[PDB]
């Protein structure tokens, strides 16, 4: 390197410059004691939104103060103390007679879209990296418990699904399965960070496939194979048709939980999964509303 | 630095002092043009009116970075923003703003500073350049100079609607020249008696 | 001293006499992908002073009814000189960005504007009007270009989340009042250190009016809106063909 | 030792069994330009691994009653990939080059060829068959592009000067018998730092078959010639719009 | 610079490397004692063109020989010494009756080329460099000296060309001009290297200017701007017309000459100035022939 | 409107490279400029007129 333009180069410099950094914070801020004050110059109250940052005045600045000592605990306020609490994200049905799944094996793909109440949890923030934590409630329609045997397989991406109740795939030499009563307590288990990438996304802004993207491949927009971890497998372990209906209701909880990047919460109904779509003719306010501004 | 007759249109006798300055108006709002020169001090155009051009004439090469200084004398009320770019050898006239700003410019915002320069950088494949013109010594052009709207001349009610922008060129601290000769145009039509 | 400024990257120059600071994206600067974080093994190309440099999209107008705008990144470049071609040659693609967006008006004009950067911007549709209808949106919503598109529902920005919360992403304001621009500074933001240029879009730009624009009659009526921009820190691998699909 | 050889650079290999050693053109290897040398200000880019690779231009017969061929460079490449995307985009260039020529055949076969290099090739014409007419030949046979021309009169190579002379100029042969490759290093050449791609020519490749090809009826008679260059410290500056002309 | 890949670059090195160096030489090389060889691996005589370097065998290792010490001199081959020798390379008429110059001025083009005997030494190389000395000798067509003045003026690119022997332009306050008389000795100057390059170079391969290049253009190919030094311009100093017919003859020499990558000599009769054109029809070979070749 | 020159410099507008300049300014001094000659006047001696 010999022309005086590579030497003082600053290409290839990798670390990240921080203007920011983390400081210990276990309880709420104090308020010390603070007099009148009567001078020109000094503008706490004046700002600038403009800028596109927050206000800096404190309670201080503005008016007269007592100390206080502030020891209000900021930690239930932390992503695991937000997240670690079990919700339904999903549900299988086992009838006797019926069209949904009546010949006694049922197939689930793993996704948290499903139901609202955890879907808006999740979807405050771009990127999410966790482990989990599966509970499986087995019961009838009417919630009675009777004597019979279950099993759950775990299908990875890949491996062949099974077709039938006697599928030569539930000899489960690889995949991990569970044989579980329903007399036992719900089984439960543990599973670890699968993505090939470093967090799960719930939303991708662009197309899986290369090519033209035309209006019959338009259902391929914002999927993420990323997140496609596998299917959810179960039957009556037999050879002949079972004796009673089953519902099986599953419930999963993170730990530690990893996120990124904020962004506004949902505000309208939900349609569909794995998608943004809204009704169009009914669009309501985020909130409530009245008759004049000027009275309450 | 001294004036630059970038609007050399006009030719009559009353309309003589009208070279010195082109004018700015508001738009339809597609990034128009405004004005192109070229940038050559020795060749024959606007570059002809400066005292650097005349002192070039004198000499057959040159070398070095050149400076446009412009001057809004506009309203107090008036603002909006343009772009002057400079295109190098070898590339047409451009066609749009899209294209003009492929090359080396800078955006002028009016305001409290009325003026803002644009400096012609030095680049050539030789060390010098002799005096360019239609024909094979076309191999030494430096480039071309245009001007366009980037947004608006925005003006409030009762100020005009039409202001005028006055150029400056001169040298840099790198330029030089070499081979002295004679004066292209000599000022004599007879005997001076 | 925070009013005036002057950016320069590369051979491109911008000078501004009204600004209200600059905004750096979650307090980080662009860089480099370091060794650790890096997993193709090729070594990556950087041009330089050939693609890191201001690029202007196109003139937009301001009218008393306007509803918005949005930008799609680094979509708008996949076409425009040697940051183009590069981006279509290659593979992969990873680069920071710097947005810089203008509009002047006089001192009897009113209005305000906000400038805000969403990474991962889906669109969605509005389901047939009843919810009923499993639709999605034509790839000229999706991907505009570098003409934009315009928004039909601002109040849910199209995607179903409400706009009194986009403050929470790297935004300014541009109040004809106060100043006439605003300056964004974006690093990398992916889960993968890079990725491809023509099948993933980082994040969109949205220029939404909340306070509409006002004047009395004599005054000028046409008020554009220009969005200029300029790459930091690029890297390109994986040489290939020229595709443009 | 000599016989076998591997050359590496980008993304690109090349591999040979039957070779006579590489000539390095004028014992100098291309490099950067210097500061005392250079005089535009403006910085240059230097896109590396992109650029510097080997391209394969084209396949030539070999026939019994062949003339010769000439290319000339970079003239060639002015229309394949980022190389000619950066040649055409900005104004102006310097690189060096690496030559290499492929032609096989079998132990029953016979010829010989000579591989020559030739700054400022300049093409004159026959001047109406009388030295009467000043005519100036096409720009197809100036600058025939990557398809190459085919010479007329060999023996004064279409210029005036003889052939036996030719190997003043950095050469190799390739005898049938011998080799069947040729390699040759030149380092950039001119008498400014910088020039335009597309108005100049710095040097022309020359391949003259001396002795003719000759084998018996039952062998294969398909004796194909092969081209393959990379360029090597390449350098651009002056960006402006992309011309084509 | 953080990465592994900047660090160990090459990129800027901008010096050459050169493999191999001059070494003084003065005089023709010595002739060692030698004696017969009879072994087997060492073979100087066998080599291989195909490299396309010259052979390396000499006299001791072909031959028996002898001691002899050689004291020939070498410095008849430089540069200078074979440049340094003034040659014709161009001629001005000016007839007082005729349709060249009648009228009593002339303008010449500065060149080489006009003339076969100094342009063949010339174009032997691609790149020169060098001052010059020009010499003007002034006669009548039949050499008989006569009483008359004459003035030169060196006119430079882009300075205005006389139009007429009363022209404004032979003022001469800028452009240098001489004033001699035909009784005196023939007149000399000096000139210097005044190329924007940095070497005057004899074959340009390319065009001048910018665009398409078509057929009618086709007069511009080959032409080189940094060859063209200005014109030469002659009168004779008077307002009437001058009494006798004047030719003038311009002879120059080099000085301080530097040369760059040699190339083949001419082997066909010149046709045009700055042009390689040759004569179809009629291509002669370089040298003469015999009947066979197994006599003489 | 202040009367001064511009004070930019190539290096404040766009990204430059180190050039080492050796031009010489001695052809633009005063007497490199006029020391030459040139006509100043003519006499006119005739025989007639
Ligand atoms: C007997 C074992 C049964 C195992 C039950 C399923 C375990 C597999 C869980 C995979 C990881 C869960 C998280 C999945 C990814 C994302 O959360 C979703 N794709 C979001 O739609
Ligand atoms: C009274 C002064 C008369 C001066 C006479 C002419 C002097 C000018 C000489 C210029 C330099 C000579 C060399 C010219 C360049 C190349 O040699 C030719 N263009 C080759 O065609």
Tied chains: 1, 5.
Aim: glycine residues 8%; contains cysteine; aromatic residues 10%.
């Amino acid at each position: 390197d010999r022309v005086a333009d590579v030497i003082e180069s600053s290409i290839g410099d990798s670390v990240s410059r921080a203007l920011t950094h983390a400081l210990p914070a276990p309880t709420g801020q104090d308020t010390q004691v603070s007099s009148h004050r009567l001078d020109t110059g000094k503008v706490p109250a004046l700002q600038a939104a403009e800028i596109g940052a927050s206000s800096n005045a404190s309670d201080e600045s503005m008016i007269e103060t007592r100390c206080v000592l502030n020891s209000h605990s900021t930690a239930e306020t932390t992503l695991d103390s937000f997240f670690s609490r079990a919700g339904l994200v999903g549900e299988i049905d086992l009838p006797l007679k019926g069209t949904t799944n009546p010949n006694g094996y049922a197939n689930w793909d793993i996704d948290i879209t499903g139901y609202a109440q955890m879907r808006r949890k999740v979807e405050l923030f771009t990127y999410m990296r966790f482990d989990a934590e599966f509970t499986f409630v087995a019961c009838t329609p009417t919630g009675e418990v009777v004597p019979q045997l279950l099993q759950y397989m775990f299908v990875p991406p890949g491996a062949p699904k099974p077709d039938s109740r006697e599928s030569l795939a539930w000899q489960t030499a690889t995949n991990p399965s569970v044989f579980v009563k329903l007399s036992d307590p719900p089984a439960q288990v543990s599973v670890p960070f699968m993505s090939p990438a470093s967090a799960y996304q719930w939303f991708y802004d662009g197309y899986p496939t290369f090519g033209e993207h035309k209006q019959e491949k338009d259902l391929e927009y914002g999927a993420c194979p990323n997140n496609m971890m596998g299917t959810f497998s179960v039957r009556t372990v037999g050879t002949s048709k079972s004796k009673y209906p089953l519902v099986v209701r599953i419930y999963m909880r993170m730990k530690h939980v990893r996120a990124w990047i904020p962004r506004p919460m949902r505000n309208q109904n939900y349609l569909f999964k794995a998608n943004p779509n809204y009704a169009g003719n009914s669009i309501k306010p985020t909130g409530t509303s009245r008759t004049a501004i000027t009275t309450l | 630095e001294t004036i630059l007759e970038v609007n050399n249109v006009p030719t009559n006798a009353t309309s003589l002092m009208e070279r010195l300055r082109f004018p700015v108006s508001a738009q339809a709002g597609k990034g128009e043009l405004c004005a192109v020169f070229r940038a050559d001090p020795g060749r024959n155009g606007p570059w002809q009116s400066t005292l650097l051009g005349q002192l070039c004439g004198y000499y057959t090469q040159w070398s070095g970075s050149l400076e446009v200084t412009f001057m809004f004398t506009g309203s107090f009320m008036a603002t909006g923003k343009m772009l002057i770019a400079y295109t190098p050898p070898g590339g047409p006239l451009p066609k749009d703003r899209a294209t003009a700003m492929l090359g080396t410019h800078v955006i002028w915002d009016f305001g409290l500073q009325s003026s803002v320069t644009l400096v012609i950088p030095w680049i050539s494949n030789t060390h010098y350049r002799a005096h360019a013109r239609d024909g094979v010594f076309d191999y030494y052009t430096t480039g071309l100079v245009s001007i366009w709207y980037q947004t608006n001349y925005v003006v409030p009610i009762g100020a005009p609607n039409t202001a005028y922008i006055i150029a400056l060129a001169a040298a840099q601290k790198n330029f030089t020249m070499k081979l002295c000769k004679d004066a292209s145009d000599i000022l004599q039509t007879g005997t001076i008696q | 001293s925070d009013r005036v400024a002057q950016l320069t990257i590369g051979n491109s120059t911008i000078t501004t006499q009204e600004a209200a600071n600059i905004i750096v994206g979650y307090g980080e600067w662009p860089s480099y992908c370091s060794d650790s974080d890096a997993t193709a093994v090729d070594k990556p190309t950087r041009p330089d002073v050939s693609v890191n440099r201001f690029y202007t999209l196109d003139t937009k107008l301001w009218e008393k009814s306007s509803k918005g705008w949005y930008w799609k990144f680094p979509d708008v470049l996949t076409e425009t000189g040697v940051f183009g071609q590069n981006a279509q040659f290659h593979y992969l693609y990873r680069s920071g960005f710097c947005i810089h967006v203008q509009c002047n008006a006089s001192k009897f004009h009113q209005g305000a504007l906000l400038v805000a950067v969403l990474p991962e911007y889906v669109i969605g549709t509005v389901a047939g009007g009843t919810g009923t209808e499993d639709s999605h949106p034509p790839y000229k919503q999706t991907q505009p270009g570098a003409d934009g598109f315009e928004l039909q529902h601002p109040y849910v920005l199209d995607a179903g989340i409400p706009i009194s919360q986009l403050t929470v992403c790297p935004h300014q304001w541009i109040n004809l009042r106060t100043n006439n621009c605003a300056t964004i500074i974006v690093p990398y933001i992916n889960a993968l250190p890079f990725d491809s240029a023509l099948n993933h879009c980082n994040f969109g730009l949205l220029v939404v009016p909340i306070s509409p624009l006002d004047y009395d009659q004599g005054a000028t009526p046409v008020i554009p809106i220009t969005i200029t921009l300029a790459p930091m820190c690029s890297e390109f691998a994986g040489l290939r063909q020229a595709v443009t699909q």
